[PDB]
């Protein structure tokens, strides 16, 4: 019931991990800019 909303809180913690994943996306697009510099 409402405990699945706490599972949704866990999912939102994993969504913050997802935000770290777009941080890694910034990382890889920065390396793409670096290979453009190359």
């Amino acid at each position: 019931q409402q405990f699945e909303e706490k599972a949704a809180s866990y999912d939102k913690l994993e969504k913050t991990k997802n935000r770290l994943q777009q941080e890694l996306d910034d990382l890889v697009v920065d390396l793409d800019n670096q290979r453009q510099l190359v």
């Binding site: 866990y10 913690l13 994993e14 991990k17 770290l20 941080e23 890694l24 990382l27 920065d30």
Partner: protein
């Protein structure tokens, strides 16, 4: 050990088992950077 959402890890000083979730962990950087001047170059940017 890789199983579920958690990993039993090894303490680099003790060699002892500790279980912790895979989604509540933070990593490091290769030794090619050390004594940085600004934290902008922290390519794996995390608080630790």
């Amino acid at each position: 050990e890789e199983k579920g959402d958690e990993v039993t890890v090894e303490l680099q000083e003790n060699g002892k088992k500790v279980t912790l979730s895979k989604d509540d962990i933070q990593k490091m950087n290769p030794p090619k950077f050390s004594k940085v001047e600004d934290m902008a170059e922290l390519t794996c940017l995390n608080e630790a």
